[PDB]
Amino acid sequence: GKVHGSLARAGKVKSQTPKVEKQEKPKKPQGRAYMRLLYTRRFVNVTLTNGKRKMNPSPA
Amino acid sequence: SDAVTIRTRKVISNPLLARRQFVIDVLHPNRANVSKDELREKLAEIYKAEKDAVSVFGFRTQFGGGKSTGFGLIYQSVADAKRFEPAYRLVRYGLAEKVEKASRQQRKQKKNRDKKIFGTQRRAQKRAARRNAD
C-alpha cells in the first residue's frame, strides 16, 4: 500500500485534553475487608428496582 | 514467672565417647529463653556432674515462646570432654582459645606461592637476591 503521511499531528488529542486532578478521596479497604464490603452491597442491602439490578447506575 | 523446668528424653549412655547424650526440653514461661551457660549450670546441679563436662547446643524456641528444645552431652570427666568435643564448642564454653590464622585467601595464595620454589626458602631467596645485582 501507499504509505506516507504528515507526522505533525502526533499526540493531538492527549496534548489538548484539559488536565483534571484526582480528588483526594478516602482510601479503599484492602484484603479481607474489601470482600466484606462487596458481600453486603450485593446480598444484604439489595438496591434492586423491582427486578432491575444495576451495579453502576448512572444518575438518571 | 521463672520456674525453669528441664526434661531429658532419648537419653543414650555412650561409653564409646565416654559421655551421656540426650535431648533437652526447657520450659521457661514468662521468660524469653534460657542461655546455654545457664542451662549448663542447672544441668550440672541436677545430675551432680562437673559444669565443664556438660555441653548444650542446637536450641530452638517453639512458636509462642515458653519452650525450647536442644541437644546435650555429659562426659564422665572434663578430660574426656576435652578429647571428644569439636573445637568450636570448647571455645563457646571457654575451655579453649580460638586459633588465629590468616584468611583462606591468604593461606591459599601462600601455598601456591611456595609451589614455585624447589628446595629451601633460604636457598631460593639467596639465589633470587644474587640475580638482582641492583
Partner: protein, 259 residues
C-alpha cells in the same frame, strides 16, 4: 570413564540405608570388601543413622580409631567398611554383639544377639573347586576362603564358620525342606522352607518358598540363603518378626491393636 568411581551421590545410594534427601549432596561410598556395594551396610550408617551413637561423620571416625569396633572378631577402623549379611559387629565397650540379618521390610534389622551366638557365623557356599597343589576350597558369600572343607559340601550349601579360626563346624546340604531367608528381590527378608526347586539349564533356577503362614512366593536361586535344617530350626537367632510378610491391611490391624 578413565577409572573407578570414588563418590556416591545421595540419591544413588542403596535405598535400604534409608538416608534423607536434604542432608547433603553425597552418601558414603562403601569400600571394597567382603560384600558387594549394593548389598552392604557401611559402618558410618550403622553407628550414626541406626544406633545414633554418633551425631555426625566426625564422631564415627573417633569411635573406630579407639579400636572399639570389631567385625567378625577383628578390629576394623575403616568408616566405610562394607559390612553385610551374617557379619558380626562387636562393641565390647558397650558389651553388645549384633548380626546383620534382613528384616521382613527389606532393610538391615538392628538384631542384637547373645555373646554365645556371636562366636560363629553362616556363609553361603558360592563355589567349590581345586586350588594350586590340588587343594579344594570353599568361597562363602562374604569372600572368605576356607581350605579343606568336608568333601560332601557343594555349591548353594550353607557352612557354619567358627569365626575365630575360620574353619567349618558343620554344614547344611541344599535340599527340599530347608529353612531359607531370601537375600534379594522384592521378597527380601521373608523366611520359609523350600517347597520345589525348578531347574532351567542355561538360565536362572527358581525356588518356591512357603511362608510360615502357607504363603507361597518364587525367587531366584541367587537370592536363596539356607539358614536351617528344617522348619522352626534356624541356626542363628532371627530378627523380630521371624521373616513373615504381612499385608498392609494386616499391618494396620496389628498396629491398631498394639496402640
Amino acid at each position: 570413564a578413565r577409572g573407578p568411581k570414588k563418590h556416591l551421590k545421595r540419591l544413588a545410594a542403596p535405598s535400604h540405608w534409608m538416608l534423607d534427601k536434604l542432608s547433603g549432596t553425597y552418601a558414603p561410598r562403601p569400600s571394597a570388601g567382603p560384600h558387594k556395594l549394593r548389598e552392604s551396610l557401611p559402618l558410618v550408617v550403622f553407628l550414626r543413622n541406626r544406633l545414633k551413637y554418633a551425631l555426625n561423620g566426625r564422631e564415627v571416625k573417633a569411635i573406630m580409631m579407639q579400636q572399639h569396633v570389631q567385625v567378625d572378631g577383628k578390629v576394623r577402623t575403616d568408616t566405610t567398611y562394607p559390612a553385610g549379611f551374617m557379619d558380626v559387629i562387636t562393641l565390647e565397650a558397650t558389651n553388645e554383639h549384633f548380626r546383620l540379618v534382613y528384616d521382613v521390610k527389606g532393610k538391615f534389622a538392628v538384631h542384637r544377639i547373645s555373646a554365645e551366638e556371636a562366636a560363629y557365623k553362616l556363609g553361603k557356599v558360592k563355589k567349590v573347586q581345586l586350588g594350586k597343589k590340588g587343594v579344594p576350597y570353599v568361597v562363602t558369600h562374604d569372600g572368605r576362603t576356607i581350605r579343606y572343607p568336608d568333601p560332601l559340601i557343594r555349591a548353594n550349601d550353607t557352612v557354619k564358620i567358627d569365626l575365630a579360626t575360620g574353619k567349618i563346624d558343620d554344614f547344611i546340604k541344599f535340599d527340599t525342606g530347608r529353612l531359607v531367608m531370601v537375600t534379594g528381590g522384592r521378597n527380601l527378608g521373608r523366611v520359609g522352607v523350600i517347597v520345589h526347586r525348578e531347574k532351567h539349564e542355561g538360565g536362572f533356577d527358581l525356588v518356591h518358598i512357603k511362608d510360615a503362614l502357607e504363603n507361597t512366593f518364587v525367587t531366584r536361586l541367587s537370592n536363596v540363603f539356607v539358614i536351617g535344617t528344617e522348619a522352626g530350626k534356624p541356626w542363628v537367632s532371627l530378627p523380630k518378626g521371624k521373616g513373615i510378610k504381612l499385608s498392609i491391611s494386616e499391618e494396620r490391624d496389628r498396629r491398631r491393636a498394639q496402640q
